[PDB]
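Annual report, structural modelling task.

Input specification for the 2-acetamido-2-deoxy-beta-D-glucopyranose complex:
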Amino acid sequence: AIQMTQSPSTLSASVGDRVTITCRASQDINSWLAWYQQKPGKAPKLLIYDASSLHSGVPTRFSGSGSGTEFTLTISSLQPDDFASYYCQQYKSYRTFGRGTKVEIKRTVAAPSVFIFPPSDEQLKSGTASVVCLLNNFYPREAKVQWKVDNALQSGNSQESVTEQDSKDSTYSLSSTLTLSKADYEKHKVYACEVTHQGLSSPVTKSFNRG
Amino acid sequence: QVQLVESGPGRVKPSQTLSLTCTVSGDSINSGINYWNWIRQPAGKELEWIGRIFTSGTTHYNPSLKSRVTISVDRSKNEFSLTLNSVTAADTAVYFCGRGGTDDYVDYWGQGTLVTVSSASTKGPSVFPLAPSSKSTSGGTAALGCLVKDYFPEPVTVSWNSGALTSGVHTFPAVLQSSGLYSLSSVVTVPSSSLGTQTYICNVNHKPSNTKVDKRVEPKSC
Amino acid sequence: LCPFGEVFNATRFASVYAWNRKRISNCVADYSVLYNSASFSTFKCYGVSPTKLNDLCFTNVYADSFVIRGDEVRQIAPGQTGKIADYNYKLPDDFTGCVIAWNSNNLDSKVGGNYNYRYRLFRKSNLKPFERDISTEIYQAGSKPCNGVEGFNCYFPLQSYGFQPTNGVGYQPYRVVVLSF
Ligand SMILES: *[C@@H]1O[C@H](CO)[C@@H](O)[C@H](O)[C@H]1NC(C)=O
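The model returned the following structure:
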């Protein structure tokens, strides 16, 4: 099949900037390309077809160019309504989609507020302990959450979750949950999540002692 | 204009046959030049074209799903449906139907319906408090929340103080644990000086199991 | 300058049953510069000399563009009969213009088959010259009514060219542009 490589993966922009998203086909697709816009939770909306033809009702600030193996979607003056995800679809041989490009709101670097929650006594009665590490209102999205149990680095028993960019302060929040059995939880004393982020000169560590 | 509504069971079991129906209103299914499509989108992934049916019945499929996909048309009811058999866990996605004037793109879309594939049947969630502590307080702002753990299927809806508290609320997207069950946490940042004068109650609602839990989150001094 | 480039260099072409027509007036036409490339695999003028266009002033120029099979290009001429000439696009007997067709197997042919291009297969009567029929009514070839559904003696009037790159030159897509002066 024809594979669409879309670049960049994530894109930080401000209102009024000139956004350029590129789509690359694995083989020649001539001018048979389409561009879609999709906001989180809603259905995609058609923007461009035939690589350069604007879909009816689409604002004129959208423009499509390119042919062969290189295609470009250009937004002249970005607007708040345009912060979404954009996909390119070829239709030279069946219909294949690109992985998409996310246009996020750019803002100044914001350091996260780090919190840590031990497992509740109600959950421990069930035989499971869940330790929650919270990273509040940071930017950019890139952040590392390192779990340490009695100074031993943990990996393989934690899962993360990132919120969509807040439409007001343009920040992200992250929730990392460490899960042990109650028996394994009572085998250790020191539980810590070490947060490394661009807004932090040194990694911040929040921790508690079991008890 | 053309309006497309997806319907079907959102909790199909593995190796069974997934069936979804798209109700077309505003335009006819057996006249004109239209390409009635099925498109699915896994969570956090890109779109995947399933297949199309022309107004004459001729079908065209994505070659990867050609052996498991059959798209038919019920012209009496003016509906067209998709059947996907031998379904595995990788077929869990949001399924859209759409019209296209060409065999190339899709210009009209439906709201999309969520279809989950798992052997684990419906289960209500357990709600545990994320108590605000000294370790859960940074300055004059404290952090508290609720852990919505071990439920199936999606989704749950979490509100705070019956909707009276919205500022600073962060409800995180659920994570599919290795146990086949979903877990979710909802937090909120509040002033520290209110941890004993203001009551904080998260309202967890999981309609797939008819579960409604109101959990009161209180601080923990230790 | 006349927008002959938009007609010939169009990314997408119309189906033969719903053939596009572009009215061309009030411009300077590069008539002799149209046939400067060797891409045209069929260039037949009727009533006018292709060399005498640069010295002729016309009131209107109608550019009819569509896509048909290779073996059906011979039907785009006055007094021709078949399926394209009778049911899709019909030129008059006193036609005054030029028919320009070229092989477009690169664009209008796809690996899985390009089904965007269709032709009218059934019709109760032949078309009058320059008549465009875009109705998708179920054709009743037989006694019982159809009620909008196909079955016995009820068929869909539009068949599609299964355009694949492996087809012979007689079944490959050909982009036609009919200039009428
Ligand atoms: C189509 O574009 C090419 C340049 O890409 C040009 O040489 C040619 O003349 C154009 N077609 C016509 C009919 O002018």
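Helices of chain A lie at 121-124, 182-185.
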